mmCIF file of C-alpha atoms in Angstrom:
data_model
loop_
_atom_site.group_PDB
_atom_site.id
_atom_site.type_symbol
_atom_site.label_atom_id
_atom_site.label_comp_id
_atom_site.label_asym_id
_atom_site.label_seq_id
_atom_site.Cartn_x
_atom_site.Cartn_y
_atom_site.Cartn_z
ATOM 1 C CA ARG A 11 17.935 144.782 -167.235
ATOM 2 C CA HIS A 12 14.346 143.756 -167.968
ATOM 3 C CA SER A 13 11.817 143.146 -170.735
ATOM 4 C CA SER A 14 8.622 142.464 -168.744
ATOM 5 C CA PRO A 15 7.054 142.930 -165.279
ATOM 6 C CA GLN A 16 7.827 139.254 -164.574
ATOM 7 C CA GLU A 17 11.551 139.472 -165.358
ATOM 8 C CA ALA A 18 11.858 142.633 -163.296
ATOM 9 C CA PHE A 19 9.865 141.056 -160.450
ATOM 10 C CA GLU A 20 11.759 137.752 -160.411
ATOM 11 C CA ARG A 21 15.093 139.601 -160.632
ATOM 12 C CA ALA A 22 13.981 141.758 -157.683
ATOM 13 C CA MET A 23 13.042 138.638 -155.719
ATOM 14 C CA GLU A 24 16.396 137.027 -156.605
ATOM 15 C CA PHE A 25 18.183 140.016 -155.037
ATOM 16 C CA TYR A 26 15.681 140.197 -152.166
ATOM 17 C CA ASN A 27 16.262 136.566 -151.163
ATOM 18 C CA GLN A 28 20.035 136.993 -150.893
ATOM 19 C CA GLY A 29 19.676 140.224 -148.926
ATOM 20 C CA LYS A 30 20.728 142.574 -151.750
ATOM 21 C CA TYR A 31 18.037 145.081 -150.846
ATOM 22 C CA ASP A 32 19.419 148.092 -152.763
ATOM 23 C CA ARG A 33 19.363 146.139 -156.031
ATOM 24 C CA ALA A 34 16.039 144.451 -155.241
ATOM 25 C CA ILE A 35 14.499 147.879 -154.667
ATOM 26 C CA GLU A 36 15.627 149.110 -158.076
ATOM 27 C CA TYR A 37 14.057 146.048 -159.715
ATOM 28 C CA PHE A 38 10.757 146.248 -157.807
ATOM 29 C CA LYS A 39 10.467 149.850 -159.016
ATOM 30 C CA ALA A 40 11.156 148.701 -162.586
ATOM 31 C CA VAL A 41 8.086 146.458 -162.325
ATOM 32 C CA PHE A 42 5.878 149.540 -162.296
ATOM 33 C CA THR A 43 7.232 150.906 -165.586
ATOM 34 C CA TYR A 44 4.754 148.470 -167.148
ATOM 35 C CA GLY A 45 1.900 149.885 -165.068
ATOM 36 C CA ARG A 46 0.094 148.240 -162.154
ATOM 37 C CA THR A 47 -2.551 146.119 -163.876
ATOM 38 C CA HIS A 48 -0.394 143.082 -164.663
ATOM 39 C CA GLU A 49 -0.547 140.135 -162.295
ATOM 40 C CA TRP A 50 2.752 141.004 -160.584
ATOM 41 C CA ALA A 51 1.924 144.501 -159.326
ATOM 42 C CA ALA A 52 0.528 143.581 -155.909
ATOM 43 C CA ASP A 53 3.443 141.311 -154.989
ATOM 44 C CA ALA A 54 5.937 143.833 -156.350
ATOM 45 C CA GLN A 55 4.480 146.622 -154.242
ATOM 46 C CA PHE A 56 4.343 144.457 -151.096
ATOM 47 C CA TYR A 57 7.933 143.231 -151.374
ATOM 48 C CA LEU A 58 9.164 146.719 -152.292
ATOM 49 C CA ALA A 59 7.863 147.941 -148.948
ATOM 50 C CA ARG A 60 9.587 144.996 -147.248
ATOM 51 C CA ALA A 61 12.859 145.578 -149.124
ATOM 52 C CA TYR A 62 12.999 149.202 -147.916
ATOM 53 C CA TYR A 63 12.259 147.913 -144.423
ATOM 54 C CA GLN A 64 15.022 145.296 -144.545
ATOM 55 C CA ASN A 65 17.340 147.978 -145.938
ATOM 56 C CA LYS A 66 16.449 150.164 -142.946
ATOM 57 C CA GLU A 67 14.845 152.819 -145.123
ATOM 58 C CA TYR A 68 11.851 153.004 -142.768
ATOM 59 C CA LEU A 69 10.190 156.204 -144.005
ATOM 60 C CA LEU A 70 10.313 154.941 -147.578
ATOM 61 C CA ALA A 71 9.039 151.548 -146.392
ATOM 62 C CA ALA A 72 6.126 153.233 -144.589
ATOM 63 C CA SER A 73 5.105 155.161 -147.697
ATOM 64 C CA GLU A 74 5.116 152.009 -149.862
ATOM 65 C CA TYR A 75 3.125 150.020 -147.271
ATOM 66 C CA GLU A 76 0.610 152.855 -147.309
ATOM 67 C CA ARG A 77 0.451 152.688 -151.108
ATOM 68 C CA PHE A 78 -0.138 148.915 -150.991
ATOM 69 C CA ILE A 79 -3.059 149.467 -148.616
ATOM 70 C CA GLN A 80 -4.449 152.281 -150.775
ATOM 71 C CA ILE A 81 -4.270 150.260 -154.007
ATOM 72 C CA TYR A 82 -5.172 146.670 -153.056
ATOM 73 C CA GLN A 83 -7.845 146.963 -150.343
ATOM 74 C CA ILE A 84 -8.985 143.306 -150.376
ATOM 75 C CA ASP A 85 -5.553 141.733 -150.612
ATOM 76 C CA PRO A 86 -5.270 139.307 -147.667
ATOM 77 C CA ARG A 87 -1.948 140.979 -146.743
ATOM 78 C CA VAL A 88 -3.507 144.394 -146.160
ATOM 79 C CA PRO A 89 -3.606 143.837 -142.363
ATOM 80 C CA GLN A 90 0.031 142.659 -142.343
ATOM 81 C CA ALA A 91 0.959 145.752 -144.362
ATOM 82 C CA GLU A 92 -0.682 148.109 -141.881
ATOM 83 C CA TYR A 93 1.115 146.330 -139.031
ATOM 84 C CA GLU A 94 4.518 146.358 -140.750
ATOM 85 C CA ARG A 95 4.033 150.040 -141.540
ATOM 86 C CA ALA A 96 3.541 150.704 -137.809
ATOM 87 C CA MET A 97 6.764 148.697 -137.330
ATOM 88 C CA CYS A 98 8.599 151.287 -139.470
ATOM 89 C CA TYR A 99 7.819 153.988 -136.952
ATOM 90 C CA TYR A 100 8.577 151.530 -134.128
ATOM 91 C CA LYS A 101 12.091 151.045 -135.506
ATOM 92 C CA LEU A 102 12.445 154.833 -135.905
ATOM 93 C CA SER A 103 11.364 155.464 -132.283
ATOM 94 C CA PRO A 104 14.602 156.577 -130.600
ATOM 95 C CA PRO A 105 15.877 156.342 -126.981
ATOM 96 C CA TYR A 106 13.649 158.186 -124.500
ATOM 97 C CA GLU A 107 15.985 161.167 -123.985
ATOM 98 C CA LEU A 108 15.484 162.224 -127.620
ATOM 99 C CA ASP A 109 12.526 163.737 -129.490
ATOM 100 C CA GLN A 110 9.655 161.233 -129.464
ATOM 101 C CA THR A 111 7.770 162.313 -132.587
ATOM 102 C CA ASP A 112 8.190 158.882 -134.247
ATOM 103 C CA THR A 113 7.221 157.119 -131.026
ATOM 104 C CA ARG A 114 3.888 158.946 -131.066
ATOM 105 C CA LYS A 115 3.542 158.145 -134.784
ATOM 106 C CA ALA A 116 4.068 154.434 -134.116
ATOM 107 C CA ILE A 117 1.549 154.326 -131.280
ATOM 108 C CA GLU A 118 -1.169 155.949 -133.421
ATOM 109 C CA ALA A 119 -0.415 153.550 -136.286
ATOM 110 C CA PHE A 120 -0.655 150.470 -134.045
ATOM 111 C CA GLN A 121 -3.800 151.779 -132.402
ATOM 112 C CA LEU A 122 -5.520 152.293 -135.766
ATOM 113 C CA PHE A 123 -4.518 148.751 -136.712
ATOM 114 C CA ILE A 124 -6.014 147.373 -133.484
ATOM 115 C CA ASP A 125 -9.250 149.328 -134.009
ATOM 116 C CA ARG A 126 -9.617 148.161 -137.585
ATOM 117 C CA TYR A 127 -8.886 144.462 -136.964
ATOM 118 C CA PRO A 128 -9.577 143.830 -133.251
ATOM 119 C CA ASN A 129 -9.240 140.023 -133.508
ATOM 120 C CA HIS A 130 -6.331 139.817 -135.937
ATOM 121 C CA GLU A 131 -3.471 137.397 -135.290
ATOM 122 C CA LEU A 132 -1.107 140.386 -134.869
ATOM 123 C CA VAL A 133 -3.138 142.261 -132.232
ATOM 124 C CA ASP A 134 -1.191 140.809 -129.263
ATOM 125 C CA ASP A 135 2.058 141.855 -130.947
ATOM 126 C CA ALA A 136 0.756 145.331 -131.733
ATOM 127 C CA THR A 137 -0.446 145.736 -128.153
ATOM 128 C CA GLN A 138 2.953 144.761 -126.795
ATOM 129 C CA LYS A 139 4.582 147.339 -129.092
ATOM 130 C CA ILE A 140 2.179 150.015 -127.806
ATOM 131 C CA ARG A 141 3.047 149.155 -124.188
ATOM 132 C CA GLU A 142 6.744 149.365 -124.990
ATOM 133 C CA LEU A 143 6.398 152.687 -126.821
ATOM 134 C CA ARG A 144 4.152 154.176 -124.108
ATOM 135 C CA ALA A 145 6.748 153.188 -121.489
ATOM 136 C CA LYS A 146 9.391 155.249 -123.276
ATOM 137 C CA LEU A 147 7.108 158.279 -123.173
ATOM 138 C CA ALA A 148 6.261 157.743 -119.513
ATOM 139 C CA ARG A 149 9.934 157.321 -118.607
ATOM 140 C CA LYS A 150 10.889 160.543 -120.373
ATOM 141 C CA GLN A 151 8.314 162.428 -118.300
ATOM 142 C CA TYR A 152 9.229 160.610 -115.056
ATOM 143 C CA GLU A 153 12.915 161.451 -115.443
ATOM 144 C CA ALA A 154 12.050 165.072 -116.278
ATOM 145 C CA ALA A 155 9.948 165.243 -113.089
ATOM 146 C CA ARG A 156 12.905 163.861 -111.068
ATOM 147 C CA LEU A 157 15.150 166.605 -112.451
ATOM 148 C CA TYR A 158 12.631 169.309 -111.440
ATOM 149 C CA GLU A 159 12.324 167.796 -107.986
ATOM 150 C CA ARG A 160 16.127 167.699 -107.689
ATOM 151 C CA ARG A 161 16.198 171.378 -108.684
ATOM 152 C CA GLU A 162 13.547 172.167 -106.067
ATOM 153 C CA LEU A 163 11.078 173.262 -108.744
ATOM 154 C CA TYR A 164 8.307 171.344 -106.988
ATOM 155 C CA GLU A 165 5.183 172.540 -108.796
ATOM 156 C CA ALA A 166 6.941 171.721 -112.077
ATOM 157 C CA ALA A 167 7.875 168.308 -110.670
ATOM 158 C CA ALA A 168 4.326 167.598 -109.479
ATOM 159 C CA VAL A 169 2.561 168.363 -112.784
ATOM 160 C CA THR A 170 5.258 166.482 -114.711
ATOM 161 C CA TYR A 171 4.706 163.387 -112.528
ATOM 162 C CA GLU A 172 0.972 163.879 -113.210
ATOM 163 C CA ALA A 173 1.676 163.814 -116.938
ATOM 164 C CA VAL A 174 2.849 160.222 -116.480
ATOM 165 C CA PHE A 175 -0.241 158.883 -114.716
ATOM 166 C CA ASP A 176 -2.820 161.067 -116.529
ATOM 167 C CA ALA A 177 -1.471 160.435 -120.046
ATOM 168 C CA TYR A 178 0.130 157.006 -119.617
ATOM 169 C CA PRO A 179 -1.752 155.250 -116.775
ATOM 170 C CA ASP A 180 -0.932 151.710 -117.967
ATOM 171 C CA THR A 181 2.848 152.116 -118.039
ATOM 172 C CA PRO A 182 4.931 150.704 -115.191
ATOM 173 C CA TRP A 183 5.953 154.240 -114.230
ATOM 174 C CA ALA A 184 2.430 155.322 -113.372
ATOM 175 C CA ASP A 185 2.211 154.251 -109.704
ATOM 176 C CA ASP A 186 5.762 155.553 -109.100
ATOM 177 C CA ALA A 187 4.627 158.869 -110.594
ATOM 178 C CA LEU A 188 1.578 159.156 -108.321
ATOM 179 C CA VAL A 189 3.914 158.791 -105.312
ATOM 180 C CA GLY A 190 6.392 161.223 -106.823
ATOM 181 C CA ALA A 191 3.550 163.729 -107.278
ATOM 182 C CA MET A 192 2.461 163.372 -103.633
ATOM 183 C CA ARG A 193 6.049 163.969 -102.514
ATOM 184 C CA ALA A 194 6.372 166.990 -104.802
ATOM 185 C CA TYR A 195 3.055 168.466 -103.659
ATOM 186 C CA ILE A 196 4.158 168.104 -100.052
ATOM 187 C CA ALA A 197 7.427 169.861 -100.839
ATOM 188 C CA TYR A 198 5.585 172.578 -102.823
ATOM 189 C CA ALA A 199 3.223 173.107 -99.871
ATOM 190 C CA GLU A 200 6.162 173.522 -97.464
ATOM 191 C CA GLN A 201 7.730 176.241 -99.595
ATOM 192 C CA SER A 202 4.389 178.060 -99.778
ATOM 193 C CA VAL A 203 2.906 180.831 -97.715
ATOM 194 C CA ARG A 204 0.738 179.381 -94.958
ATOM 195 C CA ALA A 205 -2.632 180.329 -96.505
ATOM 196 C CA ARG A 206 -1.805 178.604 -99.787
ATOM 197 C CA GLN A 207 -0.691 175.365 -98.134
ATOM 198 C CA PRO A 208 -4.039 173.605 -97.690
ATOM 199 C CA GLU A 209 -4.821 173.206 -101.394
ATOM 200 C CA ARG A 210 -1.334 171.839 -102.048
ATOM 201 C CA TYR A 211 -1.638 169.309 -99.210
ATOM 202 C CA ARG A 212 -5.107 168.476 -100.510
ATOM 203 C CA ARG A 213 -3.615 167.478 -103.874
ATOM 204 C CA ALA A 214 -1.316 164.991 -102.150
ATOM 205 C CA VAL A 215 -4.250 163.622 -100.145
ATOM 206 C CA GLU A 216 -6.303 163.174 -103.339
ATOM 207 C CA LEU A 217 -3.459 161.449 -105.202
ATOM 208 C CA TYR A 218 -3.227 158.780 -102.497
ATOM 209 C CA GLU A 219 -6.899 157.840 -102.976
ATOM 210 C CA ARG A 220 -6.313 157.496 -106.700
ATOM 211 C CA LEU A 221 -3.265 155.327 -106.068
ATOM 212 C CA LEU A 222 -5.479 153.210 -103.823
ATOM 213 C CA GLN A 223 -8.321 153.117 -106.363
ATOM 214 C CA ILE A 224 -6.261 152.498 -109.509
ATOM 215 C CA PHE A 225 -3.280 150.463 -108.203
ATOM 216 C CA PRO A 226 -4.815 148.571 -105.233
ATOM 217 C CA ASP A 227 -1.962 146.022 -105.422
ATOM 218 C CA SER A 228 0.920 148.499 -105.795
ATOM 219 C CA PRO A 229 3.895 147.726 -103.490
ATOM 220 C CA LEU A 230 4.183 151.509 -103.066
ATOM 221 C CA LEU A 231 0.903 151.715 -101.100
ATOM 222 C CA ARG A 232 2.709 151.136 -97.832
ATOM 223 C CA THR A 233 5.614 153.378 -98.871
ATOM 224 C CA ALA A 234 3.235 156.168 -99.837
ATOM 225 C CA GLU A 235 1.155 155.772 -96.648
ATOM 226 C CA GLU A 236 3.792 157.725 -94.748
ATOM 227 C CA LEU A 237 3.575 160.521 -97.303
ATOM 228 C CA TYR A 238 -0.187 160.502 -97.104
ATOM 229 C CA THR A 239 -0.004 160.667 -93.306
ATOM 230 C CA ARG A 240 2.265 163.731 -93.403
ATOM 231 C CA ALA A 241 -0.017 165.527 -95.885
ATOM 232 C CA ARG A 242 -3.205 164.581 -94.006
ATOM 233 C CA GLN A 243 -1.983 165.653 -90.560
ATOM 234 C CA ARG A 244 -0.645 168.972 -91.840
ATOM 235 C CA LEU A 245 -3.874 169.626 -93.726
ATOM 236 C CA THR A 246 -5.815 168.907 -90.529
ATOM 237 C CA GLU A 247 -3.822 171.418 -88.472
ATOM 238 C CA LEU A 248 -4.357 174.047 -91.196
ATOM 239 C CA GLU A 249 -8.061 173.283 -91.576
ATOM 240 C CA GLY A 250 -8.531 173.235 -87.816
ATOM 241 C CA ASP A 251 -6.718 176.566 -87.387
ATOM 242 C CA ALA A 252 -9.503 178.990 -86.441
ATOM 243 C CA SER A 253 -7.184 181.969 -87.062
ATOM 244 C CA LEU A 254 -6.394 181.014 -90.672
ATOM 245 C CA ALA A 255 -9.071 182.892 -92.652
ATOM 246 C CA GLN A 256 -8.463 181.814 -96.304
ATOM 247 C CA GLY A 257 -9.410 184.006 -99.259
ATOM 248 C CA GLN A 258 -11.841 182.451 -101.761
ATOM 249 C CA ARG A 259 -9.010 181.247 -104.038
ATOM 250 C CA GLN A 260 -7.639 179.034 -101.238
ATOM 251 C CA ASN A 261 -10.610 176.720 -100.480
#
């Protein structure tokens, strides 16, 4: 097998270069049987992380990237390592219908990277990954809201649409979700006892302003105007109704 860190390293690289990642990995690990002080330890650790990655062992990759960063803090590759570690979670991030634990892990990892090295070459890439991961999360919530609305659970729909624009305001689903929330609040109001309607209509009225303030160029502004008009006119009739008293909780 091997007699020195160099033989083990170069054998690992031989396997690595021809895509024999399982074998490479075994040889990178062998390097460390001679300790980590020799001149090959940094490279061995860095390419071990990459070999796991190329072998699609992302959790193992992530751990080894982390170890590289822990051990060799002024190695010029430390920023790359932090980025590629975030990529492990990115690869693990599954389709939006499934549990999004690893999606949230990836986002945090990328965000830390961006905070730590705000001008790094890889920042644009990391930002694009964040946008893509955030869109998954937004879509999951948007589709959930649609299902509630379809089931005529309108309060549930409304707050689930709000999750999209409150938690993920930069995703492409955010303006769609504001409109969806207005529609749901209108429908929630309609199913409500008269005295509890104003505050529900008020929510829809307030969401339109936010749409206008945050997405001034949204194509949905004109679409949503009709919704806003319905909410506003109904709220006016209610507010102008001299015979509708309103308990304190309804103002």
